Amino acid sequence: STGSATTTPIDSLDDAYITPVQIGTPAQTLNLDFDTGSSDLWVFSSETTASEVDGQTIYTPSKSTTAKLLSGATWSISYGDGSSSSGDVYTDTVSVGGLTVTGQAVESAKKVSSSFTEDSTIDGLLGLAFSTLNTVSPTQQKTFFDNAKASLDSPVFTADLGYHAPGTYNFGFIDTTAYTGSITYTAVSTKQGFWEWTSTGYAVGSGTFKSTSIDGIADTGTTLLYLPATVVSAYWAQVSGAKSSSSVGGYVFPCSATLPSFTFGVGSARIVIPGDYIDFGPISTGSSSCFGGIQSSAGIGINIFGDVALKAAFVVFNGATTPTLGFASK
Ligand SMILES: NCc1ccc(C(F)(F)F)cc1
Ligand SMILES: NCc1ccc(C(F)(F)F)cc1
Numbered sequence: 001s002t003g004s005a006t007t008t009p010i011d012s013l014d015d016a017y018i019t020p021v022q023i024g025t026p027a028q029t030l031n032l033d034f035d036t037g038s039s040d041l042w043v044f045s046s047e048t049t050a051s052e053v054d055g056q057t058i059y060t061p062s063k064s065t066t067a068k069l070l071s072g073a074t075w076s077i078s079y080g081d082g083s084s085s086s087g088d089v090y091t092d093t094v095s096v097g098g099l100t101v102t103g104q105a106v107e108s109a110k111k112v113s114s115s116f117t118e119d120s121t122i123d124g125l126l127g128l129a130f131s132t133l134n135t136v137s138p139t140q141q142k143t144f145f146d147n148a149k150a151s152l153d154s155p156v157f158t159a160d161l162g163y164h165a166p167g168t169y170n171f172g173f174i175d176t177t178a179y180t181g182s183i184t185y186t187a188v189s190t191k192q193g194f195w196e197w198t199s200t201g202y203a204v205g206s207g208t209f210k211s212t213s214i215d216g217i218a219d220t221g222t223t224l225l226y227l228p229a230t231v232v233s234a235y236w237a238q239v240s241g242a243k244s245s246s247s248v249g250g251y252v253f254p255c256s257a258t259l260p261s262f263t264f265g266v267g268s269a270r271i272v273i274p275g276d277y278i279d280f281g282p283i284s285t286g287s288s289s290c291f292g293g294i295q296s297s298a299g300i301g302i303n304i305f306g307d308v309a310l311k312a313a314f315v316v317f318n319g320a321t322t323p324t325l326g327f328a329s330k
Helices: 144-151 229-236
Strands: 003-009 017-023 028-035 041-043 068-078 084-096 099-112 124-127 156-160 167-171 184-187 196-204 210-218 225-227 243-245 250-254 262-266 269-273 279-282 289-292 294-296 303-305 313-318 324-329
Touching: 003 084, 028 041, 041 084, 068 099, 099 144, 184 196, 196 229, 210 225, 229 250, 229 294, 250 294, 269 324
Parallel strands: 028 124, 041 099, 210 303, 225 294
Antiparallel strands: 003 017, 003 167, 017 028, 017 084, 041 124, 068 084, 084 099, 156 167, 156 313, 184 324, 196 210, 196 262, 225 303, 243 250, 250 289, 262 269, 279 289, 313 324
């Protein structure tokens, strides 16, 4: 079997993408952020502290005839940005674009950090990293992808994110009409629980390609591209007036500049990120300083190929017994 769902940017900057997901019987539809950097399916719910909910659709297990409390199970998560949430655990039926999993662990948020409360468009997260990162205690739970794997025609899902436009998450098949050329596959390390791979180098604008190994993770749940200080400095050196700002916490650039593209290597292939994708607009309403979509990973400890990079490609997450990542131009 297969599944297919449209994902939509939450705002005009593509800060995140939401995808409708059906939970419970009868269906309760929540718009979740699909996150290949985490492994917990957690949702706003009728158990979430009332003051911490501001416009989200909530999951109500008491109205679902298939929901079962997972006795004694708890969860607690902390994301690399400082976000966090925690609560208890139900099992229920969960469907994404026609693909149904029974007995999926649904983590009901009792507490959420402020950054979730202020994002009224996001009802929760659907984690798609490897199940070794799931935070359910004392019994670790499987992700939606791991639970569906056996029933999928092919143990893959693909991410086709749009630039200021809707996109598609497909489960169980590769849409050969959705990309140009060939898909280039590259090896993945699962040792940290991420879709971790090694890029073969980079280029700035029309410059020479620099062959160098950049280890990083493919993360649909991170907005920007976080790369080593040396690479990021070489990119912003090509933008007149660009500078790293401590008060802003990143590279900013004059909103009147035009940005060069950024190329990253996948084996012998090249994925080109158009310069417009790197513009994240004014740092404050009315400002003439604009925020850059390529930032240093020095403070983070790992390089992150976030939406900025991934939306420039058709991306295959191949969850075969030896996992691989595929990239194609589109
Ligand atoms: N999108 C989930 C996520 C967020 C942060 C990180 C970090 F910071 F640990 F790399 C990994 C995964
Ligand atoms: N990387 C996971 C993640 C995704 C989204 C958010 C936001 F946007 F809701 F704050 C926080 C953390």
